[PDB]
Amino acid sequence: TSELDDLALPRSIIMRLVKGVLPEKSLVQKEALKAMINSATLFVSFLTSASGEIATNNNRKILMPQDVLNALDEIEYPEFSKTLKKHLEAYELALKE
């Protein structure tokens, strides 16, 4: 658990994400927030791994944004795809300017 704690994303940023989808004045318990912070770390690893596999299967060393988009299907979170595509579109629009 020492490793999970060193990798953990900031408690306040995660908390804001949590409360952002709950009614006003909803509370979130101690060990619940930590449960979700840790789950978030594993989700990064989970999606990264699946994306790396798709990169490897394409005989590429660089894990590319399209590997991430196709990894959503493999890890069965295809409902994130529309939003990620939107971010990707915006990212390379801003880039070219």
Partner: protein
């Protein structure tokens, strides 16, 4: 208060990218993860947290509660296929 409706800026994450990259870097099989890839992985993580919190909250709402407890988060991972990858963490 703002005078109009809320407008999201896409192409940015609210997460600290350096921290997300540190987790990404732990993967022994990845040679290099591009910045664009890191951004998308970061946004997916935001969406993931929102999803987990929503399902945890719905469980709480069933027992007429206003807040999320640890066992709400646990029961979600216990019952929902999409959260199978968390099974080790919660010792189900």
């Amino acid at each position: 208060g703002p005078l109009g409706s809320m407008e999201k800026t896409y192409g940015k994450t609210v997460l600290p990218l350096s921290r997300v990259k540190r987790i990404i870097k732990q993967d022994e099989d990845v040679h290099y993860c591009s910045n664009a890839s890191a951004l998308l992985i970061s946004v997916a993580t935001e969406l993931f947290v929102e999803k987990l919190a929503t399902e945890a909250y719905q469980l709480a709402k069933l027992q007429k509660r206003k807040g999320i407890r640890y066992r709400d988060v646990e029961d979600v991972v216990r019952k929902d296929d999409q959260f199978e990858f968390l099974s080790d963490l919660f010792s189900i």
